RNA sequence: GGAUAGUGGCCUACCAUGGUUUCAACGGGUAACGGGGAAUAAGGGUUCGAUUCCGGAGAGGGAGCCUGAGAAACGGCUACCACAUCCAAGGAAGGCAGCAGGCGCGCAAAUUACCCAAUCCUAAUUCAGGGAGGUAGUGACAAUAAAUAACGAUACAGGGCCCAUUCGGGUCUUGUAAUUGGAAUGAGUACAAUGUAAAUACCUUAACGAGGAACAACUGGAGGGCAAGUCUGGUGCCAGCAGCCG
């Protein structure tokens, strides 16, 4: 009646059919192939430190006209280079050139969020201190 | 209206240790804890025994004050209490003295230093002295 | 390595966090009984859900089955001892009909309010929190306490408390000292 | 003119907003008192029965 | 036959050419130690399990071995490789994936603390010893209960009203006001005592300890999803916000 076999001794083909079909998913394929460890900028890592290389802003998409103020960071753990986004009104000036910055995920499962092209990472901490504490003047940059 | 009253529950004789074990249930309103020495004396004239063969510990003033509960023992003789109790209880009660022990770290240091030398160090000391002599 | 003793959660936040009717009902229950947070209602709902999972599991089992008898009457005797389930309905089918308000009602807060020694629910909460009410000569500084039927008759102000008869306290003692001095 | 100053100056609006000080704000009761206040304000002091509850009704 | 404590291609000598495999053998990968279990939960399941218990393996990677009943031990030796140390340049000594602590690594993890009180263990054996272990230090990993006010007497008010001469007493209650009073209490300090091997800490408790009870609760959000503003000022597809639509 249905495509799958139904006999009491058909466990083998049911199991192997499910096992072969599981590769059609994206989460299962990523988890089993281990693509996150090999190809992603961080291997199964929620956060990662890095060094600021330069200080660039990127224009937004079509329906949204602006320039989001990002920063190019070379990761210290392995040496990869990724653009990351500093999230707030006046936080670009807070981060200076060639300082250690702790990047985090951008919240969209390693994909570009909203209208910002070619970015996948936030900025949470700079030079050991957090952006949010600087933005509300609760702490200040050590300037070392 | 102080009237510290005392009770010994679950009392069991024990000539194996020549003792009598019990749990001390002390009812004391409008008052703090019972200051063990005083309750040791109370048990002393309670059980017709000297203040030396009586021990209490493990006290706990229950929540909200009033009642308190601990553990207590009455030994047949002062000598048996001397020869059966732990040293720290004999130090608490004044019937013994704290042993003049060096701290653990220094004891271990000296143990290793004694390890360094095979046999008595009487020979090596003079040997080293006459060694740096020349 | 020593054998652990098991910590365990006692509440469960609901799935839909912003249900308007549910939020209004939770605020109604918090204000009726002076609950500090809405975690209290979550805790009572979790207790009700555990009781209810047990009740439904026992219901699924066949009638006159040793498990059904033993655990069912154990649960009923425990609940009637708590007081939430009235003696009229010791049947294990009304046990599913208990509501969160029923367990809310047996809190020491609401019991002190009912007895009248606390004229307000928040007054009951503070009076409990100030180490005044003693459930059978034992001071209880804990609002919930799940007061049981066999011991509700023994709620009164503690002897150490000024209400039960003692020295008044800091404010009154200081004012008496000031009046005596001047 | 078209643009008063240099454009995209990394926090322009925050820089030029008027800094307005906080009000004196008498202490707000906290804990169980806050829940009692909410219960009184919503279920025993029903203010605007017409329409919805309309908590925070803008004055106009 | 040898070796084994002992069976066994475990090894040797001579023979036979065999054994596994589409019921997935063999090979490759495992950011794989296995399990008891954990999260999740209509039922079926999915993911995790380095770690409090049981097993296995390892002591930088490798091999080799003495002692014994028990080791291929490594806080036992021998040698090579890698990494190193003191050096009087002839030599000597190394093994933290033990408890501390340090460098490095990385988003990511603790004090060179006290002690054998408790659990036990070792020994000639009570007594000695035990960074096993327990106690404290740091510790918002998680988990439990729960303070941040409570009640009056007054002024500004709202609902059940005796009816409805307009009233209106508020007759009956419920809130809002920098008015105003009397209480209670800890969070902290602290005589003590309990606690503990000794001390903290908790339970109890002297004496202090609440008026703006400044002893002052934050973290996010207020277009929708999704509870709450089409209030005020600022900027004007800038700055920025926005998990998605915007
Ligand atoms: Mg542009
Ligand atoms: Mg591995
Ligand atoms: Mg495991
Ligand atoms: Mg595993
Ligand atoms: Mg591993
Ligand atoms: Mg093990
Ligand atoms: Mg080994
Ligand atoms: Mg190593
Ligand atoms: Mg031997
Ligand atoms: Mg070895
Ligand atoms: Mg070692
Ligand atoms: Mg070893
Ligand atoms: Mg050796
Ligand atoms: Mg270490
Ligand atoms: Mg240890
Ligand atoms: Mg950590
Ligand atoms: Mg701390
Ligand atoms: Mg506070
Ligand atoms: Mg806010
Ligand atoms: Mg916002
Ligand atoms: Mg706003
Ligand atoms: Mg809404």
> For residue A25, what are its two tokens?
């998913």
Resolution in angstroms comes to 3.5
Contact B30, B1 (CB under 8 A): yes
Nearest Cα neighbor of A89 from A66, A73, A107 is A66
What total number of domains does chain C contain? 1
For residue D16, is it within any domain?
Answer: yes
Asked if strand E contacts A93 at the CB level, meaning under 7 A, the answer is no
Domain segments of chain A as ranges? 1-144
**Is residue C6 one of the residues assigned to a domain?**
no
The set of long-range contacts for B32-39, using a CB threshold of 8 Å and a minimum separation of 24, is B32/B61, B32/B65, B33/B59, B33/B61, B33/B68, B34/B4, B34/B59, B34/B68, B36/B92, B38/B4, B39/B4, B39/B6
Query: C131: which nucleotide lies closest, measuring CA to C1'?
Result: E185
Residue D27's φ and ψ, nearest 5 degrees, are -60, 135
Contact present, C125 and C99 (Cβ < 8 Å) = no
Separation CA D5–CA C165 (nearest Å):
77
CA of C158: nearest nucleotide by C1' is E184
> Nucleotides of chain E within 7 Å of a protein C-beta?
23-24, 30-31, 47-48, 52-53, 105-108, 113-118, 129-131, 133-134, 142-152, 174-176, 178, 182-186, 191-198, 203-206, 208-210, 212-214, 216-217, 220, 222, 226-231, 233-246
Number of folded domains in chain D? 1
Q: Beta B54-61 vs A100-105: how paired, if at all? A: unpaired
Let me know if residue C8 belongs to a domain.
no
Query: 10 Å Cβ neighbour count for C65?
Result: 11
Domain around D15: 8-60
Q: Which of D31, D39, D43 sits opposite C36 (nearest CB)?
A: D31
Q: In the numeric block, which tokens belong to residue A99?
A: 């300082």
Domain annotation covers residue D24: yes
Q: And the tokens for C44? A: 């009572």
Does D2 reside within a domain? no
At C71, list the tokens. 């655990």
* Domain encompassing residue C54: 17-182
Domains and CATH numbers, chain B: 1-134 (3.30.70.3370)
Residue C3 falls inside a structural domain: no
How many angstroms separate the Cα of A123 from the Cα of each of A103, A115, B57, C51?
5, 17, 59, 47
What b-and-e string marks burial along B89-112, b requiring 16 or more CB atoms within 10 Å of the CB?
ebebbeeeeeeeeeeeeeeeeeee
CB-neighbour burial class of residue D13 (10 A; exposed 0-12, middle 13-18, buried 19+): exposed
Which method was it determined by? cryo-EM
Query: A74-79, long-range: CB within 8 Å, 24+ apart, which pairs?
Result: A74/A50, A75/A41, A75/A42, A75/A48, A75/A49, A75/A50, A75/A103, A76/A48, A76/A49, A76/A50, A76/A51, A76/A100, A77/A42, A77/A45, A77/A48, A77/A49, A78/A41
Site from D3, D8, D9, D11 to mutate, A interface, most A CB atoms within 10 angstroms: D11
Do B80 and B61 contact (CB within 8 A), yes or no? no
């Amino acid at each position: 009646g249905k495509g799958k076999p139904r006999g009491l001794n058909s466990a083998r083909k049911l199991r192997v059919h499910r096992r072969n079909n599981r590769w059609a998913e994206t989460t299962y394929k990523k988890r089993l192939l281990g693509t996150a460890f090999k190809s992603s900028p961080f291997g199964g890592s929620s956060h990662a430190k890095g060094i600021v290389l330069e200080k660039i802003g990127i224009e937004s998409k079509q329906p949204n006209s602006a320039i989001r103020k990002c920063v190019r960071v070379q990761l210290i753990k392995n040496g990869k280079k990724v653009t990351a986004f500093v999230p707030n009104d006046g936080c670009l000036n807070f981060v200076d050139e060639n300082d250690e910055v702790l990047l985090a995920g951008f919240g969209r499962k390693g994909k570009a969020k909203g209208d910002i092209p070619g970015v996948r990472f936030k900025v949470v901490k700079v030079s050991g201190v957090s952006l949010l504490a600087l933005w509300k003047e609760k702490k200040e940059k050590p300037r070392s | 209206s102080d009237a510290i009253t005392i009770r010994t529950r679950k009392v069991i004789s024990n000539p194996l240790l020549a003792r009598k074990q019990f749990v001390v249930d002390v009812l004391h309103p409008n008052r703090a804890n019972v200051s063990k020495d005083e309750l040791r004396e109370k048990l002393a004239e309670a059980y017709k025994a000297e203040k030396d063969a009586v021990s209490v510990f493990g006290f706990r003033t229950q929540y909200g004050g009033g009642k308190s509960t601990g553990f207590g023992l009455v030994y047949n003789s002062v000598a048996d209490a001397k020869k059966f109790e732990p040293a720290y209880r004999l130090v608490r009660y004044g019937l013994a003295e704290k042993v003049e022990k060096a701290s653990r770290q220094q004891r271990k240091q000296r143990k290793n230093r004694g390890k360094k030398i095979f046999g008595t160090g009487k020979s090596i000391a003079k040997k080293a002295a006459r060694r740096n002599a020349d | 390595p020593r054998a652990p003793r098991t910590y365990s959660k006692t509440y469960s936040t609901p799935k839909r966090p912003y249900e308007s009717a549910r939020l209004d009902a939770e605020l109604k229950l918090a204000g009726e009984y002076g609950l500090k947070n809405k975690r209290e209602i979550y805790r009572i709902s979790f207790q009700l859900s555990k009781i209810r999972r047990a009740a439904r599991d026992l219901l699924t089992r066949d009638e006159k089955d040793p498990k059904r008898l033993f655990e069912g009457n154990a649960l009923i005797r425990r609940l009637v001892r708590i007081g939430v389930l009235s003696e009229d309905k010791k049947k294990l089918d009304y046990v599913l009909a208990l509501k969160v308000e029923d367990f809310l009602e047996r809190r020491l807060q609401t019991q002190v309010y009912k007895l009248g020694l606390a004229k307000s629910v928040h007054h009951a909460r503070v009076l409990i929190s100030q180490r005044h009410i003693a459930v059978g000569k034992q001071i209880v500084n804990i609002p919930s306490f799940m007061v049981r039927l066999e011991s509700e008759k023994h709620i009164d102000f503690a002897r150490t408390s000024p209400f039960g008869g003692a020295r008044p306290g800091r404010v009154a003692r200081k004012r008496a000292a000031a009046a005596g001095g001047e | 003119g078209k643009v008063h100053g240099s454009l995209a100056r990394a926090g322009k609006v925050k820089s030029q907003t008027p800094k307005v000080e906080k009000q004196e704000k008498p202490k707000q009761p906290k804990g169980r008192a806050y829940k009692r206040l909410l219960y009184t304000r919503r279920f025993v002091n029903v203010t605007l029965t017409n329409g919805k509850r309309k908590m925070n009704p803008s004055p106009s």
